[PDB]
Amino acid sequence: SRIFYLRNFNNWMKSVLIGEFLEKVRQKKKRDITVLDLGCGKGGDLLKWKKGRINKLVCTDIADVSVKQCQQRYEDMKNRRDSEYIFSAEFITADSSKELLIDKFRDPQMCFDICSCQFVCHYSFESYEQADMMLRNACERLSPGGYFIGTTPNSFELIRRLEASETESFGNEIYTVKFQKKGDYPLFGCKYDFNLEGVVDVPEFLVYFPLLNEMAKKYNMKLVYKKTFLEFYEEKIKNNENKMLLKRMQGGSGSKSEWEATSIYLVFAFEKQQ
């Protein structure tokens, strides 16, 4: 209830993001579309990927509960007696920061048209080795022209609020962010707690985007675009197709607290070169 409009927005944002890049891929492949969802969670991107008519989906999360949970969502959608075609899926429980997904694939020679990391990548930055391995699992299997897309905290905006704050903690009634130490912002291992209304689930790490961009180059990825949630909304809402979708999802106008929570995050996408 409290977080309603914010919940809606992220699924609007993720749908518009996926929809955009599924078109860019369809301008090339338009067949056997393979996708890797990193940190798939309990699913929820499933219905998004079905909408885009994906031919294959690899869902992976470090939590075995979320993976088995996500697998039931797929099966539930899959097992209707209807005609509707659903992507061939795959479910892999692994730590993508510390593990190599290539070993866990049914087909280890598998290639992906799209890799979606939604509110995940910031977890991998605990260390360089971890942060690089996550980029590896994602981008190494992208066939050229494929996209690495996702969403992570800004880290310009995060520190900006921290430095303005009197204590290490900052936020509002709908969310609370607590850094372990203020003023020290190491490229890796910079650690803070992200607590939505609820209990804080796991610590996050600071992702400075210029760094993520540099490390992505290792895997031959060039940045397509990087935009804050504010910039993304302003632009993509220009389309009156998308504006209908947001009012349909009943997202959009939130409390000043909800609108504050967003604009911390930024969407991004990379493209694999030859």
Ligand SMILES: Nc1ncnc2c1ncn2[C@@H]1O[C@H](CSCC[C@H](N)C(=O)O)[C@@H](O)[C@H]1O
């Ligand atoms: N190293 C890791 N490997 C895989 N998943 C991870 C991970 N670290 C965190 N995660 C997962 O990141 C997710 C955060 S939220 C769920 C994101 C999902 N794409 C959605 O939009 O619903 C959690 O599921 C968490 O288990």
